[PDB]
Write a protein that binds this DNA or RNA. Structure first.
Ligand SMILES: Nc1ncnc2c1ncn2[C@@H]1O[C@H](COP(=O)(O)OP(=O)(O)O)[C@@H](O)[C@H]1O
Ligand SMILES: Nc1ncnc2c1ncn2[C@@H]1O[C@H](COP(=O)(O)OP(=O)(O)O)[C@@H](O)[C@H]1O
Ligand SMILES: [Mg+2]
Ligand SMILES: [Mg+2]
Ligand SMILES: [Zn+2]
Ligand SMILES: [Zn+2]
Lengths: 651, 621, 49
DNA sequence: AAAAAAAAAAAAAAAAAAAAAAATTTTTTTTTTTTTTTTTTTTTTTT
């Protein structure tokens, strides 16, 4: 055999401390519950909060952070022992239970640039964007061979010597028996582990301006291989180590470094929100007690900082809630995504509304008229340059799939790009193809666009068709088109100015002392935890300088986010009464005689107008948590479309 | 562990004593008859159905699904052992490899010395003398997996996936057993190839040369060797099964033997096979370990869900005179109205008869261009036709442009050569190419489409490519607006240019709104007198029509000429018509006759063709 | 020791170089810890015994 | 019964064969990374 340790004092102490920490039963069983949850979910990787670990035993936390491999092995042994104690069969099912880390890393939290050799063999939490990924390959961790000549069955094991001294003996795949009998490998019986290599680059918006970006190579293994794709703003918690070179004889002293990832995370904004019992109870209470005016309350509480534009705010809320897709048995599809175009006079806060949607709605992609040009906007087809094979790169729409694309300077956008996105706006999919590849990417995103009317400022004395240079083909697929006019009414100016000045004079309680400048400079960002991958919530915003007073509260941002997320899943069904009402209203709307004279249509009326009527009714039902599209929902939809589709020509 | 001799006996027992009533209710030895056939060398591929196996031995099915390669070899060896006792006569030596096998067996018998024990390596390899191949058919209880989810945890298992075929190499000979002949003794040497590469042998290990201690340099040659039809394809996930924001994932499928030439790029396929690795030596492995590629070895390829490769009920349905209208109304039942448009689309899906009179082809394809205002369901119609037709390519404005429509050149991997890969038109070579936003399509793309319409080919004379492609597809363009935009370029080419103007109207708009709202209520069109045909039935009927070439009797010659002359006079008097319009008449009438499933076109078909043509023409006004 | 003025036109990424290496014997698994590495772009030949 | 001669025993030194031990970096390849270039294609400007 060989050397076998008997009394490793450090290993015994580490195992004891980690098992004590994982007991947690007296410590409100946080990690007991986590272990039980992973057992039920059939997972074999425990994510541990380093902050809790440090609180329990700062010594163990420091030892783990500064000595990665040894302490991680001890932690995994303790986790396997705990899993066996809770349930032995599962522990025997899974050979090794891995431990990934999470929380606030004081100094270990770095970027690919600040990640220097001082962090070798330490636990580092590096932020960045995945520049490239590799195919998921299986590495044999235990091979099984059968010898026909002797009917024997052997099993060879290969250890994970990724960042350890490896010799030819350990990495030789048997191909003969001791008597030179050919073997045959039993692939089914053999054990493989999935392995992938990615590249994390410093975020361009974080990198020093004008310099080339700093990268790092990351190794992912079983249960972490496909946690990211190129262009993902990922946080990788791992162990930084030097990769061994090939058996040489002369060494230059240069060692490639790599990050053995122990955990991968995406932007927490798109993550599944945590709904506690009290939170769901509050949502139930809100929906039940207030249903008649809940949609109006949410619409008015949507963007507190932007005054007026009540109809536009309601339309934006409908866009956020979305409709419901129709998946017909014969494959025909109907989008449930509302498209909104805000056009009007300069300085009407349309860009502010788009920015608010970007900040709030999950999977919201900003874009500018000329910022994205075709292949950048939709998907693109390139070549690997190393394999000679075609490859697909997701554009803004694809990345915004099941989300929102907030486009600004839509008018400035070239006609080619608008023609290209025509398909996305209605079918919600991108159809690209080159000679060696063809795909139909899913882009189920709602387009919220902003534009400036021709002549810079809206012309009250010209038809909306002439004011808007967008042709009918592109106008139709916009479900709602709102003309936001900078009317010069003295009273509206009074209200707007009062709101703006109040918002400017507001200061955040506690953090601001009356003279602080909150800007930081490229260091505090890494010093403190990133508020982009981080881990009690009220319902109505407490009175503050934002508003003076009234008998109508304003919904909290977090509560509104949770409520919208819950309500978006609802798929209210269209009732016969609402269906008949919508059909008759669509007939009347299409019949031009209904609308008065001196009134010009913003956009043409079409079957798509009917479809957006249905979608708006569905969105109102979702807001109400109704589960059925009712007469009030149909009324609100018809009201909104009637307001949006007609504008009075002044003279 | 398991005793593979016992497993071989189990598979022998199953293969011998499994019976089914498939043959017209009569009990039959499903696999016994196949064994007889391939012992006579009348069949090559033996597809063992794991549902059949599980009918009496579920544990064997589980073991196969866990170690499919091992049991694949067990089944192949059992078949080979059983063949001699099922042979009932002498084969006719249909193949040179059969000649080689006959000679090898005869000479082994001649130098048998039955009692003597020959060394384990002094024997013909199993693969060298098979002339057959055993594949599986995955058990129906195994839910198909997603290419993304097929990972290292299921290597060596038997799994079935479904997806779109993107890239498919050609069929080329892959060495399976390299045969060498010595220059001193006169024996043969056999190297069974398993790795992607092999190092040819130099010295002959035959007994005679070993005794002589002579040179014994042996010569690799293809005559006595054992090749197998080989292909390598890329299979792509389906759009509906891809995650929210990701792109579809690809898998490599290695097809061998009789599974070749089944799938072609653009096909929707389901492939069942074993998830196996390829050793990845040769590179400067950055990370230590035995890393390997991944691939699916094709055991069962089945085109499905768009291009799947009769009954008294369907015969009666065809015999019904309103079968034409039934199919038309079944085309996109959700879309309200557009009855004549849907009838034209059905005529497109059917197509006319191809003509080859004295060295020039008058193609029978039907070209239709849907001009219309926004929101008249042109895109929906084109998408539905794409889903319905067997070989359908739906190309939007510019995402698939240039080489997205025409072929390009890409480096290969099996040969490292420059292979010509087809574009959308070639992928729809003999089907339907639904072009959307044809007006906004690029100029080069529009010229390519014009050329394919006029010739069914695509000539290219660029730098890296110089070829004359073949794309015998029918163009279904959907442009938007001489009204306001009615190019003579489109008029002169499209056999049916339809204008779809939606003037507001209380009654029609209300009916359409009720249709739409019921559709959104029940995920289906409102119930009608006639239930629309399922896509499978529509495809079956259309395919049966396609092979029903009706001819034009000389009696209708004067009738057609009179109609054409009358249309010419009307067009001349009014404020476009030509031989292209006459050929449109001819092929539309032929397609209507084909739909009726007769051999001779009739005045009713001619009248319907003229009626559709006049509806299209006066849609302009 | 020279002193030179100039303008930088490139700056590679901060790689890792070894000041002290350790080596192990494949057969007897004995170590030769803390072998000093010459500073600068200077290599090192492994022992052959 | 003792002394003288013979022979044996014990012990040490030397030689021959056979198994063991010691010594033993340079040269070439080649892969990856970077840059260069030719053509195709796309965008912008002008009439
Ligand atoms: N109704 C309004 N209420 C509050 N602020 C407004 C309003 N309209 C315009 N603004 C102010 O105008 C500024 C810039 O507007 P912007 O979002 O650029 O609109 P646009 O995109 O039309 O230029 C914002 O800081 C915003 O506070
Ligand atoms: N005649 C119709 N019957 C049913 N639905 C229709 C009809 N016309 C338009 N629609 C609906 O309106 C929407 C827009 O149709 P689309 O296919 O984009 O028209 P276009 O081809 O003119 O762009 C689709 O969701 C479609 O379901
Ligand atoms: Mg703006
Ligand atoms: Mg369209
Ligand atoms: Zn020989
Ligand atoms: Zn040693």
């Amino acid at each position: 055999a060989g050397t076998v340790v008997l009394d490793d004092v450090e290993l015994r102490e580490a195992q004891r401390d980690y098992l004590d920490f994982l007991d947690d039963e007296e410590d409100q069983g946080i990690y007991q519950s986590k272990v039980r949850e992973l057992i039920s979910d059939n997972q074999y990787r425990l994510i541990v909060n380093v902050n809790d670990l440090r609180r329990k035993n700062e010594k163990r936390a420091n030892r783990l952070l500064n000595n990665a491999f040894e302490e991680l092995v001890a932690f995994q042994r303790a986790l396997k022992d705990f899993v066996a104690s809770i349930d032995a069969t599962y522990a025997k099912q899974y050979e090794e239970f891995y431990v990934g880390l999470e929380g606030s890393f004081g100094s270990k939290h770095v970027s690919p640039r600040t990640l220097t050799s001082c962090f070798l063999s330490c636990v580092v939490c590096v932020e960045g964007i995945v520049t490239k990924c590799s195919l998921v390959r299986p590495k044999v961790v235990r091979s099984v061979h059968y010898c026909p000549a002797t009917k024997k069955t052997i099993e060879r094991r290969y250890s994970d010597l990724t960042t350890l001294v490896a010799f030819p003996s350990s990495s030789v795949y048997p191909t003969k028996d001791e008597e030179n009998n050919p073997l045959e490998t039993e692939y089914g019986l053999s054990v493989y582990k999935d392995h992938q290599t990615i590249t994390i680059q410093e975020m361009p918006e974080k990198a020093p301006a004008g310099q080339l970006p700093r990268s790092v190579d990351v190794i992912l293994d079983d249960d972490l291989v496909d946690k990211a794709k190129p262009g993902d703003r990922v946080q990788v918690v791992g162990t930084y180590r030097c990769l061994p070179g090939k058996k040489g004889g002369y060494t230059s002293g240069t060692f490639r470094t790599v990050l053995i990832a122990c955990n991968v995370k995406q932007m927490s904004k798109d993550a599944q929100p945590s709904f506690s019992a009290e939170d769901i109870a509050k949502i139930k209470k809100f929906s039940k007690t207030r249903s008649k005016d809940i949609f109006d309350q949410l619409a008015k509480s949507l963007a507190p900082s932007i005054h007026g534009h009540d109809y536009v705010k309601k339309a934006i809320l409908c866009l956020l809630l979305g409709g419901v897709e129709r998946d017909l048995e014969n494959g025909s599809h109907i989008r449930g995504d509302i498209n909104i175009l805000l056009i009007g006079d300069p300085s009407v806060a349309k860009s502010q509304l788009l920015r608010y949607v970007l900040c709030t709605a999950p999977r919201a992609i900003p874009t500018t008229g000329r910022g994205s040009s075709g292949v950048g906007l939709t998907a693109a087809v390139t070549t690997d340059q190393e394999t000679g094979e075609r490859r697909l790169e997701a554009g803004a729409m694809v990345l915004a799939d099941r989300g929102v694309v907030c486009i600004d300077e839509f008018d400035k956008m070239s006609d080619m790009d608008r023609t290209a996105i025509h398909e996305v706006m209605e079918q919600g999919r991108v159809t690209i193809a080159k000679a060696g590849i063809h795909a139909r990417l899913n882009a189920r995103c709602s387009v919220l666009a902003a534009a400036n009317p021709v002549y810079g400022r809206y012309d009250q004395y010209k038809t909306p068709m002439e004011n808007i240079g967008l042709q009918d083909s592109l106008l139709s697929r916009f479900d709602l088109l709102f003309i936001m006019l900078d009317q010069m009414d003295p009273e509206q100016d009074r209200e707007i100015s009062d709101h703006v000045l109040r918002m400017h004079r507001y200061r955040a309680p506690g953090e601001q002392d009356g003279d602080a400048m909150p800007l930081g400079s490229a260091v505090d960002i890494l010093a403190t935890d990133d508020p982009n991958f981080s881990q009690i919530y009220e319902k109505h915003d407490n009175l503050l300088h934002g508003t003076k007073k009234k008998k109508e509260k304003m919904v909290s941002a977090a509560f509104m986010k949770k409520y919208i997320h819950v309500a978006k899943i609802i798929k209210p069904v269209l009732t016969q009464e609402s269906a008949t009402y919508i059909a008759e209203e669509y007939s009347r709307l299409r019949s031009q005689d209904s609308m008065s004279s001196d009134t010009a249509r913003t956009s043409p009326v079409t079957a798509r107008t009917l479809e957006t009527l249905i979608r708006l009714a569905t969105a109102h039902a979702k807001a109400r948590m109704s589960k059925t599209v009712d007469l009030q929902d149909a009324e609100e939809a018809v009201e909104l479309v009637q307001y949006a589709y007609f504008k009075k020509v002044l003279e | 562990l398991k005793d593979y001799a016992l497993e071989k006996e189990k598979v022998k027992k199953f293969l011998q004593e499994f019976y089914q009533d498939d043959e017209l209710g009569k009990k039959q030895f499903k696999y016994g008859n196949q064994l007889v056939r391939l012992a006579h060398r009348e069949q090559v591929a033996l597809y063992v159905d794991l549902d059949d196996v599980a009918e009496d031995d579920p544990e064997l099915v589980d073991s196969i699904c866990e170690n499919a390669r091992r049991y694949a070899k067990l089944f192949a060896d059992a078949v080979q052992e059983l063949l001699p006792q099922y042979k009932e006569r002498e084969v006719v030596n249909k193949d040179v490899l059969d000649v080689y096998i006959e000679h090898r067996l005869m000479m082994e018998q001649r130098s048998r010395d039955p009692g003597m024990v020959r060394s384990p390596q002094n024997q013909y390899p199993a693969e060298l003398m098979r002339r057959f191949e055993l594949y599986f058919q995955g058990p129906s209880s195994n839910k198909p997996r997603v290419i993304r989810e097929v990972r290292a945890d299921s290597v060596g298992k038997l799994v079935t996936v479904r997806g779109i075929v993107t890239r498919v190499s050609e069929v080329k000979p892959k060495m399976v057993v390299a045969t060498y002949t010595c220059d001193q003794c006169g024996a043969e040497t056999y190297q069974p190839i398993q790795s992607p590469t092999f190092m040819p042998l130099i010295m002959c290990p035959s007994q005679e040369c070993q005794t002589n201690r002579s040179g014994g340099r042996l010569y690799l040659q293809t005559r006595g060797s054992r090749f197998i039809k080989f292909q390598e394809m890329k299979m792509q996930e389906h759009s509906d099964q891809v995650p929210v924001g990701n792109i579809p994932r690809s898998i490599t499928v290695l097809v061998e033997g009789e599974n070749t030439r089944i799938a072609q790029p653009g096909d929707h396929v389901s492939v069942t096979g074993i998830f196996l690795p390829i050793l990845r030596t040769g590179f400067r492995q950055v990370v230590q370990g035995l890393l390997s590629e991944t691939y699916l070895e094709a055991h069962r390829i089945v085109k499905m869900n768009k291009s799947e490769d009769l009954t008294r009920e369907e015969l009666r349905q065809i015999a019904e005179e309103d079968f034409y209208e039934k199919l038309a109304a079944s085309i996109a039942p959700e879309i309200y109205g557009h009855e004549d448009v849907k009838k034209a689309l059905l005529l497109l899906l059917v197509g006319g008869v191809d003509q080859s009179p004295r060295g020039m082809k008058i193609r029978g394809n039907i070209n239709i261009c849907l001009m219309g205002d926004p929101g008249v369901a042109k895109s929906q119609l084109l998408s539905y036709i794409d889903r319905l037709a067997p070989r359908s390519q739906y190309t939007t404005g510019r995402g698939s442009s240039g080489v997205g429509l025409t072929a390009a050149v890409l480096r290969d991997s099996v040969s490292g050569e420059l292979t010509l890969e087809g574009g959308a038109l070639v992928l729809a070579d003999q089907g339907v190419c639904c072009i959307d936003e044809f007006d906004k399509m690029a100029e080069a793309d529009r010229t390519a489409i014009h050329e394919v319409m006029e010739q069914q080919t695509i000539s290219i004379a660029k730098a890296g490519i110089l070829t004359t492609l073949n794309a015998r597809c029918s163009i279904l363009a959907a442009a938007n607006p001489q009204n306001i935009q009615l190019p003579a370029a489109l008029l002169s080419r499209f056999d049916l240019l339809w204008l779809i103007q939606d003037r507001p109207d209380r009654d029609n708009d209300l009916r359409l709104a009720q249709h739409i709202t019921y559709v959104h209520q029940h995920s289906r069109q409102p119930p009608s007198q006639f239930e629309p045909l399922d896509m499978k039935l529509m495809r079956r009927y259309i395919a049966m029509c396609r092979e029903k070439q009706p001819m034009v009797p000389e009696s209708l010659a004067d009738y057609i000429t009179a109609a054409y002359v009358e249309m010419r006079r009307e067009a001349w008097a009014s404020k476009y018509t030509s031989a292209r319009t006459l050929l449109a008449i001819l092929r539309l009438s032929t397609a209507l006759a084909r739909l009726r499933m007769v051999d001779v076109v009739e005045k009713e078909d001619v009248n319907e063709a003229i009626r559709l043509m006049e509806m299209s023409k006066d849609s302009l006004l | 020791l020279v002193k030179i003025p100039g303008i930088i036109i490139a700056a590679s990424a901060v790689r890792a170089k070894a000041t002290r290496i350790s080596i192990q014997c494949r057969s007897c698994r004995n170590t030769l810890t803390n072998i000093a590495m010459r500073p600068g772009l200077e290599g090192y030949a492994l022992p052959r015994k």
